[PDB]
């Protein structure tokens, strides 16, 4: 399909979730606010949970592109990690990421289909990308870990940090871009220390 | 205060704060449920805000006794950190904790005053304790960090890892106690690697 078409349905869905929740917004309303037939909307997004999850997928890929996770021969590992950490910190703390995570929280154990879709679209894609990268870094002998997937998870938990928790529950302490950057550098240095090769 | 009275009042307050909502629970309902007088409740908890605060403080202190945050001279640091990590893991993965964290996130726009009560009662007190202990660990010269409070937040993010996130969004079950133990042991080992004094 035309990029305009997919972007239009995703942006219309996004715009509608940031006013009404999963419950409030409806696929007929998405079709009407996107300027496309209900048929084209079912034609690409079988059900609402699929649509929500796929918009998540798009935002993630935008802020953390697949290129970021290539460790070319001779590439500087520090710069790669730093870019992934920066992209991730922007992603999770963006207004749209926060809104959609609070909608997802509003129906955790009351909506298992949305829970499993949401997880597979956002967190799972990022952890897979990162496990691939960390496996390449293990091969090159730059880092050392028994399980690279667990290391990817530690990396993202460290980057996310308590700041994001506070910003999510409504105690939005005014956060500098300066403070955010000191955080991401400190975390990448901590990760490199903790996973150094050579002992 | 008399322990049977405090126990009845907390059990009632928790059950009501769950079965109905925080806004659907009243001091009068808590009183009547606990088998005590309105005056008893107001004598030991000024208002519903304070009762909620005290419930949260209470669960934290049960799973994380202040005794944990004291580093006896020459005492092994790894058992100390393991105890802290095991208690925090239990604290945050309980059904009460998962339910409340979901709620705080799902009602950030509606009532962030509640979210600030929550933050000040639980997360901030646990970080305060952990900062104090990590300062004692710096002074024994076993661990090194520029900012023990940032190190405490790193500790806790690593401890509530990806599994806790999956449980919050409604897409996994809690880990059994042996799995959680494997996780915490990995995390404490990493943290000791990452903050080893002498590099």
CATH (domain of B33): 1.10.10.60
Q: Would you say residue A199 lies in a domain?
A: no
Q: Resolution, in Å, please? A: 3.0
Residues A58 and A89 occupy one common structural domain: yes
State in Å, rounded, how far the first CA of chain B is from the last one.
Answer: 49
Q: Are residues A101 and A39 in the same domain?
A: no
Measure CB to CB from residue A108 to each of B102, B108, B111 and give the nearest one. B102
**The token pair that represents B120 in the structure block:** 């000040």
Residues B1 and B69 in one domain: no
Contact A41, A10 (CB under 8 A): no
Q: Give the bridge partners for B143, in sequence order.
A: B196
CATH number of the domain within which A114 lies: 1.10.357.10
Structure tokens at B19: 């079965």
**Rounded CA gap, B9 and A195, in Å?**
48
Residues B95, B159 share a domain: yes
Distance CA(B50)–CA(B75), nearest Å, equals 37
Classified as helix, coil or strand, A143 is strand
Among B93, B155, B170, B179, pick the best mutation site for testing chain A contact (most A Cβ within 10 A): B170
Query: Are A77 and A18 contained in the same domain?
Result: no
Q: Chain B contact for A77, CB < 8 A?
A: no
Helix pair B95-106, A95-106: axis angle to 10 deg: 130
* Same domain? B77 vs B172: yes
Listed in sequence order, the residues at least 6 apart from B143 whose beta carbon sits closer than 8 Å to its beta carbon are B77, B134, B137, B151, B192, B195, B196, B197
User: Token pair 């649509």 is at which residue?
Assistant: A51
Q: What is the total count of domains within chain B?
A: 2
My answer on whether B33 and B58 are in the same domain is: no
Q: Which residues of A touch B123 (CB under 8 A)?
A: 162, 165-166
Q: Are residues B91 and B17 in the same domain?
A: no
Q: Specify the experimental method.
A: X-ray
B192 interfaces chain A, CB cutoff of 8 Å = no
Contact of A78 with chain B, judged by CB distance below 8 Å, is answered with no
What residue numbers bound the domain in which A141 lies? 53-194
**3-class DSSP assignment, residue B90:** helix
Residues of A in contact with B186 (CB under 8 A): 150
Are B19 and B72 contained in the same domain? no
Put simply, the chain B residues between 101 and 130 with a CB less than 8 A from any chain A CB are: 101-102, 104-109, 111-112, 115-116, 118-119, 123, 127
Query: Considering only CB atoms, which chain B residues are within 8 Å of A110?
Result: 170
CB contact under 8 A, B157 and A157: yes
Looking at the fold, whether B68 and B5 belong to one and the same domain comes out as no
In a shared domain, residues A13 and A95? no
Which pair of structure tokens corresponds to residue B48? 């519903």
Are A62 and A121 members of one domain? Answer: yes
Altogether, the residues listed in chain B come to a count of 199
Q: Which of B109, B170, B187 sits opposite A109 (nearest CB)?
A: B170
* A7 close to B (CB below 8 A): no
The tokens for A116 are 């499993």
Write the CA distances from B172 to A23, A54, A60, A112, B102, integer angstroms. Answer: 22, 20, 22, 10, 15
């Amino acid at each position: 399909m035309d990029p305009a078409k997919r972007e239009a349905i995703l942006e219309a869905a996004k715009r509608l979730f940031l006013c009404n929740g999963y419950d409030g917004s409806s696929m007929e309303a998405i079709a009407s606010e996107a300027g496309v037939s209900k048929l084209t909307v079912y034609s690409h997004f079988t059900d609402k949970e699929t649509l929500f999850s796929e918009a998540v997928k798009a935002k993630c890929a935008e802020q953390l592109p697949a290129l970021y996770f290539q460790l070319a021969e001779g590439a500087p590992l520090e710069k790669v990690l730093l870019n992934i950490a920066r992209g991730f910190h922007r992603l999770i703390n963006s207004h749209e990421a926060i809104a959609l995570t609070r909608l997802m929280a509003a129906q955790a154990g009351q909506n298992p289909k949305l829970s499993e879709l949401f997880f597979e679209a956002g967190p799972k894609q990022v952890i897979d990308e990162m496990e691939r990268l960390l496996e390449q870094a293990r091969r090159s002998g730059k880092l050392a870990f028994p399980d690279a997937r667990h290391a990817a998870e530690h990396f993202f938990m460290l980057v996310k940090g308590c700041a994001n928790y506070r910003l999510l529950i409504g105690c939005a302490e005014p956060l500098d871009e300066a403070e955010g950057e000191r955080h991401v550098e400190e975390v990448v240095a901590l990760f490199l220390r903790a996973f150094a090769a050579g002992g």
